[PDB]
Design a protein around this motif. Structure first.
Motif, short mmCIF file in Angstrom:
data_model
loop_
_atom_site.label_atom_id
_atom_site.label_comp_id
_atom_site.label_asym_id
_atom_site.label_seq_id
_atom_site.Cartn_x
_atom_site.Cartn_y
_atom_site.Cartn_z
N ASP A 58 0.85 -1.18 0.00
CA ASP A 58 0.00 0.00 0.00
C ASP A 58 0.90 1.24 0.00
O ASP A 58 2.12 1.12 0.14
CB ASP A 58 -0.94 -0.02 1.21
N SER A 59 0.30 2.42 -0.18
CA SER A 59 1.03 3.70 -0.13
C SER A 59 1.10 4.28 1.30
O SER A 59 0.13 4.18 2.05
CB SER A 59 0.43 4.73 -1.11
N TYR A 60 2.23 4.87 1.68
CA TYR A 60 2.39 5.42 3.04
C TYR A 60 2.02 6.90 3.15
O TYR A 60 2.42 7.71 2.31
CB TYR A 60 3.81 5.16 3.59
N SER A 61 1.25 7.26 4.18
CA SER A 61 0.78 8.65 4.34
C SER A 61 1.24 9.36 5.65
O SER A 61 1.03 8.87 6.77
CB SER A 61 -0.76 8.75 4.13
N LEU A 62 1.88 10.52 5.49
CA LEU A 62 2.21 11.38 6.62
C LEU A 62 1.01 12.25 7.05
O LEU A 62 0.36 12.88 6.22
CB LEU A 62 3.40 12.27 6.27
N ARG A 63 0.74 12.29 8.35
CA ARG A 63 -0.34 13.09 8.92
C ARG A 63 0.27 13.83 10.10
O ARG A 63 1.18 13.32 10.76
CB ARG A 63 -1.48 12.19 9.42
N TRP A 64 -0.21 15.04 10.37
CA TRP A 64 0.31 15.78 11.52
C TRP A 64 -0.78 16.67 12.16
O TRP A 64 -1.77 17.02 11.51
CB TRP A 64 1.60 16.58 11.15
N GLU A 65 -0.62 17.01 13.43
CA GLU A 65 -1.51 17.95 14.08
C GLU A 65 -0.69 19.07 14.72
O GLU A 65 0.45 18.85 15.17
CB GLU A 65 -2.45 17.24 15.10
N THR A 66 -1.27 20.27 14.71
CA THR A 66 -0.64 21.52 15.20
C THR A 66 -1.53 22.21 16.24
O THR A 66 -1.95 21.59 17.23
CB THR A 66 -0.37 22.47 14.01
#
Ligand SMILES: *[C@@H]1O[C@H](CO)[C@@H](O[C@@H]2O[C@H](CO)[C@@H](O[C@@H]3O[C@H](CO)[C@@H](O)[C@H](O)[C@@H]3O)[C@H](O)[C@H]2NC(C)=O)[C@H](O[C@@H]2O[C@@H](C)[C@@H](O)[C@@H](O)[C@@H]2O)[C@H]1NC(C)=O
Ligand SMILES: *[C@@H]1O[C@H](CO)[C@@H](O[C@@H]2O[C@H](CO)[C@@H](O[C@@H]3O[C@H](CO)[C@@H](O)[C@H](O)[C@@H]3O)[C@H](O)[C@H]2NC(C)=O)[C@H](O[C@@H]2O[C@@H](C)[C@@H](O)[C@@H](O)[C@@H]2O)[C@H]1NC(C)=O
Ligand SMILES: *[C@@H]1O[C@H](CO)[C@@H](O[C@@H]2O[C@H](CO)[C@@H](O)[C@H](O)[C@H]2NC(C)=O)[C@H](O[C@@H]2O[C@@H](C)[C@@H](O)[C@@H](O)[C@@H]2O)[C@H]1NC(C)=O
Ligand SMILES: *[C@H]1O[C@H](CO)[C@@H](O[C@@H]2O[C@H](CO)[C@@H](O)[C@H](O)[C@H]2NC(C)=O)[C@H](O[C@@H]2O[C@@H](C)[C@@H](O)[C@@H](O)[C@@H]2O)[C@H]1NC(C)=O
Lengths: 406, 397
Positions: B321-329
């Motif tokens: 599968d494809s890898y996804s970066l997620r972030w919270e601020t």
């Protein structure tokens, strides 16, 4: 120019709870002073800030090799577009000074200006004004200093005036010199006010009475109080090169002497100072001296016998058979007994003395010449000099050059 | 110091009828004096030689760049071996000066020597001597001048002594400073001698009493007599780089508010200090004739506007599968990923404005990459510094 703490301080916030401050200090300063970071609430409350040592300075460069970086955290519950924190440094102890100035005892009167000189014959009137009713002109007194252009200010005559002009005369000035003067304002002995005098005015500059610019000048003598009278004086570089001065002294009448050696020194670009030390073996008995600078007996002794330039010889060319010979006579010197040496040269016409057959003969009066080129023009010259132990000199100029053809 | 005419003269004769001389004046000297050649016949008798101009100098060099060479011919019957001629040069007119000096009116006493400082607690005993019944110690008066090293001699304080020592205390001396002193000898007023002082002794230095190095020092205020009170003081460069000093004044029923003076001009005096100047305006000196003047730390503050100095906390980061970066601020995010033998200034570098997400291209089915992010604002009247990097996060593709 703005403290190092204040230059290095950068305070950034998370716009929710924090402010982190980073600022530095030098060790150089800390051996003398320390300072806290201070934050201030309103026109009154001024809150200390809690910093600890940081080994780094990631927000601003510190211009100094010896910095002590800090890092501090300041809590907050609120942030709004308009919020401005005001930051400061309090030093570890009170530092300061005071002075209680009674104005009347701390007066520095204004400096004179518009300095100006006008000749009246051999006097020079020096005027100036002062920009000024708490300090009236009668509170004032002026100090004028003057010197020749080539002298130190160190060594200069003062002249005091209660008004704002002074007259300088021949009792104050040497003739044909350029003089400089300056003026400062002083509080009057009588003023109810004291302080210190003004800075000097700018300089004004002028020529004294024209006189003779060749004359030596400024002859001065000072006695050490023991056995030496030191005299000095000046003369123009150009005049010292045509005239030898000596220093002569004699006691005033109750036999006249030359002081020696004279030492020399540059004095600006036109004069030389000379010094002499006159010996005074008995100041009690002969305690008044009359001393002059005047032309010395300076002669070049030139012994005639040893500086003889003889007159050139007369020269002629001879044939007799087909062999040619040069002959030469020198003016009879009454009956003197004096050996002469002659130098003889001859040229092919189309050639140069520089590279020529130059034989040299003592006491001869002719020289037979070798055979030579077919039909060529020739030249010949001779010159003489003495050549005997009583005598010396330089060559005579060459004889007239004597032409001829084969 | 031979003169140019004389250095230059050469006279050669033909031992029969005459002497020829050549020599040279300079143009420079001719402006002030011309000179005649002179041949001395005998003790009492000088005679002028008539010279005329020559273009050349076939007998001697001329050491000036502009000579006026001459050629003279003097006739003589009679010559013989013992003969010496004496030649000299007469000025075109009488030149000279003449001073008549009475020794008691013309004395210069001797230079003082062996200057020493000795300390006596907080005082300094300066001593020296003069190597001398014509001039006696009692004719003598000593004038001593002293000053801080970094000051000019211009108006230094004189102290006078009629013996060959002098004392200098805290009344005379700024603490924690270096003083230089010199002495010279003078004729006592009551002496029937007159003249001029000796030249100065060699200098001596010493360090005055120590005091509180750190304070500003040397506050001086002078009033021009009309409208202004110029003040100056010194602070050490070390201190100045930590404390901003100001100048404050209050003029003398109840008292007034204490006021600040500006601008404060700065100038670099000596190795240790900088000198400051301020102009205080005084309007009514006849009523306020006393001003108390203080130099103290000022309200010198840095204004930091919160809204224009935001640094944020690092975002929190993840990877899923494809890898996804997620972030919270209104935020700008920079996202970086990397290969493991390569650093960051090799790695791929990317800006994302108001995204909390990022998808990734093909990656190596082998490698185990790293990834950080950070943030700043874009909100339009706002500014700051980049955030620190988020926790660097890993995963194996
Ligand atoms: C400003 O604040 C700093 C640090 O707190 C001071 O520097 C330090 O001064 C201390 C005196 O309170 C020194 O402590 C001593 O340490 C020795 C061994 O290191 C101990 O045996 C002994 O108990 C002492 O108390 C400390 O040496 C020094 N820090 C340094 C630089 O090593 C500072 O004092 C001044 O700053 C430095 C540059 C030193 O030369 C000091 O001695 C100097 O006076 C404080 N400044 C002032 C003027 O109060
Ligand atoms: C030493 O003697 C020399 C030469 O004789 C003097 O310099 C010469 O001064 C002459 C004045 O007598 C000048 O000749 C003049 O020519 C001008 C036109 O160009 C005329 O207006 C003037 O009336 C004369 O006919 C000449 O300038 C000068 N010769 C040289 C080579 O400079 C010298 O006198 C002094 O030097 C100059 C500045 C002079 O013109 C004089 O004013 C000055 O006193 C003699 N030295 C001294 C001190 O008398
Ligand atoms: C030269 O200096 C001396 C040593 O300091 C003088 O004595 C002092 O100077 C004052 C004169 O202005 C005098 O009043 C001081 O009280 C005195 N102080 C001490 C402790 O020595 C000296 O002055 C003369 O001698 C003194 C004792 C007085 O009688 C004065 O009237 C004299 O002028 C000076 N020497 C001279 C003789 O000028
Ligand atoms: C400033 O004002 C006056 C005018 O130039 C001077 O008064 C002169 O006083 C002399 C007293 O002995 C006297 O020669 C003159 O009559 C007079 N000058 C003239 C004719 O104008 C004054 O000198 C001072 O005055 C005297 C009375 C003393 O107090 C002295 O000690 C003063 O020097 C002038 N300035 C100075 C500083 O000399």
């Amino acid at each position: 120019e703005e403290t190092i703490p204040l230059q290095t301080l950068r305070c950034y916030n998370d716009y929710t709870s924090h402010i982190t401050c980073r600022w530095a200090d030098t060790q150089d300063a800390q051996r003398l002073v320390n300072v806290t970071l201070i934050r201030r609430v309103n026109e009154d409350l001024l809150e200390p800030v809690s910093c600890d040592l940081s080994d780094d300075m990631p927000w601003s460069a510190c211009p100094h090799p010896r910095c002590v970086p800090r890092r501090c955290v300041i809590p907050c519950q609120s942030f709004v577009v308009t919020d401005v924190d005001y930051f400061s440094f309090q030093p570890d102890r009170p530092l300061g000074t005071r002075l209680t100035v009674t104005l009347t005892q701390h007066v520095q009167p204004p400096e004179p200006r518009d300095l100006q000189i006008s000749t009246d014959q051999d006097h020079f009137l020096l005027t100036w004004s002062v920009a000024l009713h708490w300090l009236s002109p009668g509170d004032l007194e002026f100090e004028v200093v003057y010197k020749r252009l080539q002298d130190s200010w160190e060594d200069a005559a003062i002249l005091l005036s209660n008004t704002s002009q002074a007259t300088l005369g021949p009792e104050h000035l040497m003739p044909s010199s350029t003089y400089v003067a300056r003026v400062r304002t002083r509080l009057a002995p009588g003023s109810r006010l004291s302080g210190r005098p003004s800075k000097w005015s700018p300089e004004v500059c002028w020529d004294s009475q024209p006189g003779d610019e060749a004359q030596p000048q400024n002859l001065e003598c000072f006695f050490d109080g023991a056995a030496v009278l030191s005299c000095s004086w000046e003369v123009r570089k150009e005049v010292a090169s045509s005239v030898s001065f000596g220093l002569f002294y004699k006691p005033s009448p109750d036999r006249e002497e030359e002081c020696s050696p004279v030492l020399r020194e540059g004095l600006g670009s036109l004069h030389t100072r000379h010094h002499c030390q006159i010996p005074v073996p008995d100041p009690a008995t002969h305690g008044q001296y009359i001393v002059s600078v005047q032309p010395r007996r300076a002669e070049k002794h030139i012994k005639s016998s040893v500086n003889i330039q003889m007159a050139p010889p007369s020269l002629q060319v001879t044939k007799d058979g087909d062999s040619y010979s040069l002959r030469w006579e020198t003016m009879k010197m009454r009956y003197e007994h004096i050996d002469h040496t002659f130098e003889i040269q001859y040229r092919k016409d189309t050639a140069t003395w520089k590279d020529s057959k130059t034989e040299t003969l003592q006491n001869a009066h002719s020289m037979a010449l070798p055979a030579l080129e077919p039909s060529t023009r020739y030249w010949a010259r001779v010159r003489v000099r003495t050549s005997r132990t009583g005598y010396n000199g330089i060559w005579s100029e060459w004889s007239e050059a004597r032409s001829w053809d084969t």
